[PDB]
Design a protein around this motif. Structure first.
Motif, short mmCIF file in Angstrom:
data_model
loop_
_atom_site.label_atom_id
_atom_site.label_comp_id
_atom_site.label_asym_id
_atom_site.label_seq_id
_atom_site.Cartn_x
_atom_site.Cartn_y
_atom_site.Cartn_z
N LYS D 174 44.40 29.19 19.07
CA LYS D 174 43.79 28.98 20.35
C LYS D 174 42.45 29.75 20.34
CE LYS D 174 43.41 31.20 23.87
NZ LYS D 174 41.97 30.76 23.92
N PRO D 207 44.77 30.54 28.57
CA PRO D 207 45.23 31.43 27.50
C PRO D 207 46.68 31.89 27.65
CG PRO D 207 42.96 31.95 28.00
CD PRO D 207 43.42 30.93 29.04
N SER D 228 41.54 42.40 23.82
CA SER D 228 41.67 43.66 24.49
C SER D 228 42.99 44.38 24.19
CB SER D 228 41.42 43.51 25.99
OG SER D 228 42.48 42.89 26.70
N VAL D 231 45.78 43.22 26.96
CA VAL D 231 46.32 41.92 26.62
C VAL D 231 47.16 41.97 25.33
CG1 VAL D 231 45.73 39.55 26.04
CG2 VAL D 231 44.56 40.70 27.91
N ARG D 330 31.06 40.66 32.17
CA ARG D 330 30.37 41.67 31.35
C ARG D 330 29.23 42.36 32.13
NH1 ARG D 330 32.10 44.76 28.74
NH2 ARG D 330 33.81 43.76 29.87
N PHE D 382 31.78 47.91 25.65
CA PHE D 382 31.63 46.54 25.14
C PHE D 382 30.34 45.87 25.65
CE2 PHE D 382 33.56 42.64 23.28
CZ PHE D 382 34.10 43.20 22.12
N1 LIG Z 1 37.00 42.14 19.13
C1 LIG Z 1 37.82 42.53 20.08
O1 LIG Z 1 38.79 43.19 19.74
C2 LIG Z 1 37.57 42.12 21.54
C3 LIG Z 1 37.06 40.84 21.83
C4 LIG Z 1 36.83 40.46 23.16
C5 LIG Z 1 37.14 41.37 24.19
N2 LIG Z 1 37.63 42.61 23.93
C6 LIG Z 1 37.91 43.58 25.05
O2 LIG Z 1 38.35 43.02 26.30
C7 LIG Z 1 37.50 43.35 27.41
C8 LIG Z 1 37.45 42.28 28.50
O3 LIG Z 1 37.37 41.00 27.87
P1 LIG Z 1 37.36 39.63 28.73
O4 LIG Z 1 36.28 39.70 29.81
O5 LIG Z 1 37.40 38.47 27.74
O6 LIG Z 1 38.73 39.64 29.61
P2 LIG Z 1 40.29 39.50 29.15
O7 LIG Z 1 40.76 40.90 28.79
O8 LIG Z 1 40.90 38.65 30.30
O9 LIG Z 1 40.29 38.67 27.74
C9 LIG Z 1 40.22 39.23 26.40
C10 LIG Z 1 40.56 38.15 25.35
O10 LIG Z 1 41.97 37.90 25.39
C11 LIG Z 1 42.23 36.52 25.82
N3 LIG Z 1 43.42 36.54 26.75
C12 LIG Z 1 43.52 37.10 27.99
N4 LIG Z 1 44.79 36.99 28.49
C13 LIG Z 1 45.50 36.36 27.54
C14 LIG Z 1 46.90 35.92 27.38
N5 LIG Z 1 47.75 36.14 28.39
N6 LIG Z 1 47.28 35.28 26.25
C15 LIG Z 1 46.39 35.06 25.23
N7 LIG Z 1 45.09 35.43 25.29
C16 LIG Z 1 44.61 36.05 26.40
C17 LIG Z 1 40.92 35.91 26.33
O11 LIG Z 1 40.93 34.49 26.07
C18 LIG Z 1 39.88 36.79 25.60
O12 LIG Z 1 39.46 36.23 24.34
C19 LIG Z 1 36.18 43.52 26.69
O13 LIG Z 1 35.21 44.14 27.53
C20 LIG Z 1 36.63 44.31 25.47
O14 LIG Z 1 36.92 45.69 25.80
C21 LIG Z 1 37.84 42.99 22.64
#
Ligand SMILES: NC(=O)c1ccc[n+]([C@@H]2O[C@H](COP(=O)([O-])OP(=O)(O)OC[C@H]3O[C@@H](n4cnc5c(N)ncnc54)[C@H](O)[C@@H]3O)[C@@H](O)[C@H]2O)c1
Ligand SMILES: NC(=O)c1ccc[n+]([C@@H]2O[C@H](COP(=O)([O-])OP(=O)(O)OC[C@H]3O[C@@H](n4cnc5c(N)ncnc54)[C@H](O)[C@@H]3O)[C@@H](O)[C@H]2O)c1
Ligand SMILES: NC(=O)c1ccc[n+]([C@@H]2O[C@H](COP(=O)([O-])OP(=O)(O)OC[C@H]3O[C@@H](n4cnc5c(N)ncnc54)[C@H](O)[C@@H]3O)[C@@H](O)[C@H]2O)c1
Lengths: 476, 476, 476, 476
Positions: D174, D207, D228, D231, D330, D382
């Protein structure tokens, strides 16, 4: 007490069939202390037949049982450290304290190799056709002929012996005629621990007749030699003529690069202490001290005081930190080296002479202002002599360090990451120690490049010369 | 269309300084088809100087760049495989179809080794003092002198070359004078791909003169030979005398054990196919067929039928399935082998004679009822002759398989896990193929034991003879 | 003699602060034999603080010293085998002979892991820029929380404990409240051998309160659990909620495929003896016997005679080959399994009942004509019950063997290489033994797939769950 | 030009059965640019059925064929890198130059992993009984469910995908709904290269609904998430509850230690460059700059200058060096971070505000005088914010670097071997880069410890989470 030494053939301590012996002398006095059997062709034949049988038995003993038998022998070596140390000091010259260190480190060696024999892993290769299993199996090469020198009578045997036994080969060694009792005691521990008849043998006699007969014989599948470069070349040449597997630990000529940023006191203590270990009679002994000109004078003076602090004498007397050289040839070799230094304009900062008229005592010696054409900077002195020369640029010390065809050990002293990295890449040596003396543990590879030979005597790489690698592909 | 061949020295195709050449003849006709430059000493001196600076350049190119360059060479070899194969067939004799398969598989080998060079890994060892870092570093050994024979003109160069280049070594090969154009097209692919000047060199001339000059030379840090047992003994001896690292791939005398439970049709199709590949002119060609008495006669008749079905002719005709032998000394040798077989009471079931009076055509031959003292059962025939004997018990066949000092390849046919396991542990070979012909993929070790030599030319193990291992300990 | 058991916290055998204890019963009689301290949150806190400190001390102790300390503990375990065996038999039920086997194999385990701690190797990666050194280093993960079951009180502790200590982690275990004294004796050997204060801890009490507090606590960096699948899922779920490293050895349901070509007597002896080991209370115990229809009747009858030959009784009495089941729940579980077999139309060939009215004695039982929906063919019985079912095609036995979500151990009996190979590829298990019982040596991986969990408890792979892998790139 | 995106199910690009789509917006404008299909359960059921039969097909394709197919995919990714980069920049915001570098390096990663799959080696263990063969076999774990985020839309898929495919697994990912076109072009390369139907699948939608359905499903044998910390805790918990293998790459909070002996210009150019790569939207983005007091002020001013030199704008303009943040949440998060910094007494040295009122533009920001209780020093920002603090002693900086539960990447600048060694042993990170920016080549392990997760996505170690290890012992 010093004991006479016999041959070990097929589980039995025995005389040579001729009854011939060779005399053994104490290098601290020149006086005979005992004798060792002198083997002939007929005893070698009996030894080769037994090694063939030993190989057939020992290859079938599972690695975990071989390992436990080796560990028992090590416990015995360790139990008998005092008695073995005493033998060694009397025949070889080194102080009792250093002899005990060698015997204990032999036990440590046997033990690591015991455990490594259980980790001679094959592998399974992803196949090009899934109907077929593709494997790579490791097996012992067969009976080994080994030839070992007098400078560490036990340790020069034990790596080779431990490697052969861990892989499941049999082992026949010609130990040194000038230092026979301490290695014979090492072998005796293995017999006492249960290594079967034929798996280990021990001969002495005329080295050239023994190696000339053993190396071409169809029972021997692997040759190992530790010694001089010129004898190594003759033996590797014969081994190649007879298509035998061969490894060789030959001369070194260790550089010591003391860089601009070195901790100087640490350099003197580490490289100075390592120089006079076993009176410099070591294949990795620090020899060519390349010292940055800013600290050359300070280094030289402190190395001189280190040499002057050593107590020269009989290795049984306590307080002794530098014993007799091992044989009279080593005394002559030292005078030749010192005479040549003086002739070519170098300065003898301390030592430089025989001490006394009995035994093989030479003073700890430091030579400075050494030109590049002095014998001490070209031929391996193997004696209690350090030679110092300055440099300005690290790149010129590195070029000097690589100038000779030797390349076994190298040393350096420096603090910067860039210098470590540069030295690591650029120095043509098998082994490099920085900011410390040599700590050649069994888990670490130990071997040369160029004229210093080939093959490792530490780490998992130490088993490879004793193994054959077999590709097996089976189609279902 | 066939092309004269030049030396490769410092990025240029050149004549010998002297202008001397050697004639190359087509073994299917006896007729000149071109010539190859004949190096003298002055050319070798230029090759060695270039090899030295080439080593200094190539050892600094990071592995991933070296890999990409090698993969480019591989792609060019793949694209040109049919034009390279046409050269090979004319100069060496094998059928064009075999020549194409050889060259296409050369490309596969280069690719695997290019990737393997990115995986020459060092080791970090848990230290005895936590204030020191103990590492084991791997680095290229230096300029390599390679000597290769005529049977697989391309493939005998390609593993050596690829191993050298993947480790950061430079490479100077003497390829065969009787088959020079196809190995030169292999080196050309590499020049075209961007391997820098001096990193590879190619010379031709008088094998003895070149090997006697190269092996002792200070620039050469490593030697690798593939060819006969007696020549390899001579070269490994010379290499030993100058303390040079050496690998050797020598004669084989491959047993085939066809067990009681074997599929006979499979055994004949797999082992019969393999016997007459490149007319038996292969170090791994099955030679001694040891067939369980219950199926000896049935196997013998089927192998006779297999051999009578081969189509003998010029290798350029696409339907040709057995070409001419590589050279006239090979006819002489087949005549001696068959003659001795007849004289000791063996039966010639098929073939046994030269075909025609031009070229080097010899008929595919099967010998049965072979006594253990027949030349064909002791010396490597290296030609299109199978020798059949029976056995009752599996362990008599294993002992016969191990009687000879040769030990390169082995084959067996059997269905029980017990027999597979037994053949795996007890057969003295470097490679064992069971229920299929030889599949020596680059990822699999390929090398002998006993008189067949030492060192592997497949697997990660293929890199070790081109590497030196350095123990580095740095006290912080 | 049976002793009361205390907590081990910070080098000290101590009571819980509350002073609470739990009673320990002898399963052969139902009679109380002693008691064990029942820890509360306050004792866990003191244990967690000490594990933090222990980790900081033990991580700094060089691998060769850790190794020697472990080997001493093993020598102590071995010295005390009789006394520990006696404790174990009284609390757990197994015959004295089997208890001694487990205690000795614990010593063997500690020893192999001691040596493996010295071979936690990093690596050096050929760099993309030769100015930079690229390394991969291995370090201990940190303090471990471990949770172990009653079926092998010592062995279920020792792999986990030996792995943690060899890598340099600290270790806090909650051992089984029904079998506390034998594991406490194992820990006591480590204290006596010199493992420092805090490096090891031992608690007992309410399992769910302990694992609920320990798993989320910030000191714990790694969780390990051996037990049932349903409790494993709750614990892995909590470990994931708190982002902790976790490994799990859960239920098995071992198939046994006895093929058409099997040695039937060998199958009965190997798989029959393995079934009744520790009265079937083993995660790898042979359970679903899939037997080719040609030999089903012969196999069934011989397995029945094997069960009938076992002597049931108190584990201290000599002659006893099958002791009490470990607790009363196991007796109820067996009746439920037998009742269900009869209800679904299977035949009880022997056994099937409680023996006596005191203690937890159940007869060795063999069930045939088992349909696929019997509880014994779906839920792990963990008791002295073998269930037999026939098949005609090997492919249908393999599909049955993979039908359940368990997959830990598998067994087979066959002679053909093709069947070995097919079974090797196709059977979804962590461990497969053919033509022999389970020999789970420390050098061999030991772990599941699917619902049986993840992580290995043997081989070098057993250290990986206790290690973190760090990429380090330093530019000169 | 920007392209609507579909699901990839069973070799076909398809709409959701429902026809539902989600709008995709350009973060530089807030404007719709296209839409992506929105899977429901029925689509996931088809994806899972296809993934199952895909796993069954792909696990039978020999490694060398799988490699060649993967290399073909790599070549197509390389050729299309600029068109894929244009999609990425529009949907995600990063500058085109960064997007090209991401996609070109995706091709490099595929190539390395393709070759690594040919090296998934089993082991042959020296047996305790020589009549048995003991092997350790490696095989693919099964269908994989992968969940990837928006920051590197291609690169977050490619290591997971390549690891799955190199081991023989099938793969169902996904990918992010806000950045869907570029990951779909990556999967397209693979479909075009000949990866068979079902081996890969791609879905988009809600998601939570997708992850809640996929993770418990019987077909899925392995889960892998990057995103994150909170999550990942939720998903690793769900994965634990259904006993599924799981890897997790989570938040980082990367310290930068600038030591007393550091080159300041290098530190600012390397770590300042790395901070504003993809606008700090990177799990390894340097965040906590810990600078020795002697050079704190000089470093701070130079980093301020570095940040003020970035060119903020639409990523399609080739001179743009800082694009828009990926999404509006963001901006909200940067406003909170800066606000808290101001409120706790930190100084905003540059930036600190949104730019314009359209798109997600936030100014590159540097915060100094930062107290340890500021949000920016505890939670992962981030985004394009560096936080600077001083230190006197190296060991205070190391303790601060280790205070947080995060531990993914670390950076340092220093010249002494002593400091390098110390930072190597003591910094709690999975990856440490010294004197250079981050170079996460595929050959190097890439993974966290503590709250940053577990499992590696580089090196051979990258394959282990996709493999099961099977001990096989066969008695002959
Ligand atoms: N490379 C990494 O490890 C990475 C990448 C993206 C975000 N992040 C962290 O998360 C913070 C917030 O990110 P956001 O604004 O995307 O919010 P978010 O925490 O809602 O989402 C984070 C990621 O997890 C996914 N996600 C969320 N809930 C999920 C679920 N129940 N099942 C499967 N996937 C799910 C999203 O599609 C997204 O790609 C960022 O500021 C950062 O600290 C880390
Ligand atoms: N590498 C080492 O550890 C080592 C050990 C001993 C000696 N050496 C070198 O050689 C010199 C040794 O002096 P030496 O006076 O003992 O002289 P030598 O060169 O005659 O002896 C070299 C070693 O080879 C053995 N030897 C000699 N001829 C042999 C033959 N034909 N077959 C088998 N073994 C043979 C000797 O027993 C001795 O141990 C030293 O100064 C030193 O440079 C090196
Ligand atoms: N793959 C192999 O291992 C291989 C290849 C070719 C030949 N052979 C064996 O050798 C037998 C006879 O072969 P031949 O007719 O080529 O005769 P030969 O033995 O004179 O030559 C064998 C090979 O070694 C080379 N050679 C010979 N003397 C040399 C020297 N002094 N220095 C360097 N190279 C030298 C030749 O160029 C040739 O490639 C064959 O029948 C076979 O048994 C083995």
């Amino acid at each position: 007490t010093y004991t006479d030494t016999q041959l070990l053939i097929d589980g039995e301590w025995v005389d040579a069939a001729s009854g011939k012996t060779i005399d053994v002398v104490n290098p601290a006095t020149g006086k005979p202390i005992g004798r060792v059997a002198h083997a002939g062709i007929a005893d070698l034949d009996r030894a080769l037949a037994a090694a063939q049988s030993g190989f057939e038995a020992w290859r079938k003993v599972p690695a975990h049982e071989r390992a436990a038998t080796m560990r028992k022998a090590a416990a015995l070596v360790r139990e008998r450290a005092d008695a073995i140390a005493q033998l060694m000091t009397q025949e070889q010259g080194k102080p009792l304290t250093e002899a005990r260190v060698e015997v204990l480190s032999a036990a440590d060696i046997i033990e690591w190799f015991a455990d490594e024999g259980r980790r001679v892993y094959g592998r399974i290769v992803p196949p090009r056709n899934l109907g077929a299993q593709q494997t790579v199996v490791k097996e012992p090469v067969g009976p080994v002929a080994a030839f070992t020198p007098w400078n560490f009578p036990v340790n020069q045997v034990v790596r080779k012996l431990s490697a052969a036994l861990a892989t499941g080969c049999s082992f026949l060694v010609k130990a040194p005629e000038e230092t026979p009792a301490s290695p014979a005691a090492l072998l005796r521990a293995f017999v006492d621990a249960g290594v079967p008849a034929g798996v280990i043998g021990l001969v002495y006699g005329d080295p050239a007749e023994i190696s000339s007969y053993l190396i071409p014989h169809p029972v021997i599948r692997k040759v190992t030699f530790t010694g001089s470069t010129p004898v190594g070349k003759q033996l590797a040449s014969l081994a190649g003529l007879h298509m035998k597997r061969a490894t060789m630990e030959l001369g070194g000529h260790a550089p010591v690069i003391v860089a601009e940023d070195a901790d100087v006191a640490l350099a003197v203590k580490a490289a100075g202490g390592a120089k006079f270990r076993n009176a410099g009679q070591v294949c990795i002994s620090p020899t060519r001290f390349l010292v940055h000109n800013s600290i050359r004078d300070e280094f030289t003076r402190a190395l001189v005081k280190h040499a002057e602090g050593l107590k020269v004498g009989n290795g049984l007397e306590e307080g002794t930190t530098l014993g007799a050289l091992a044989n009279p040839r080593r005394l002559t070799a030292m005078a030749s080296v010192i005479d040549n230094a003086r002739k070519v304009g170098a300065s003898i900062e301390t030592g430089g002479e025989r001490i006394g008229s009995e035994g093989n005592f030479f003073a700890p010696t430091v030579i400075a202002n050494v030109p590049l054409d002095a014998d001490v900077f070209n031929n391996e002195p193997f004696g209690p002599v350090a030679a110092i020369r300055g440099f300005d640029k690290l790149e010129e010390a590195i070029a000097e360090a690589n100038r000779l065809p030797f390349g076994l050990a190298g040393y350096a002293f420096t603090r910067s990451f860039a210098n470590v990295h540069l030295l690591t890449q650029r120095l043509e040596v098998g082994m490099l120690w920085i900011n410390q003396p040599a700590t050649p543990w069994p888990e670490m590879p130990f071997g040369g490049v160029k004229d210093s030979g080939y093959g490792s005597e530490g780490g998992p790489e130490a088993l490879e010369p004793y193994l054959v690698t077999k590709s097996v592909t089976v189609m279902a």
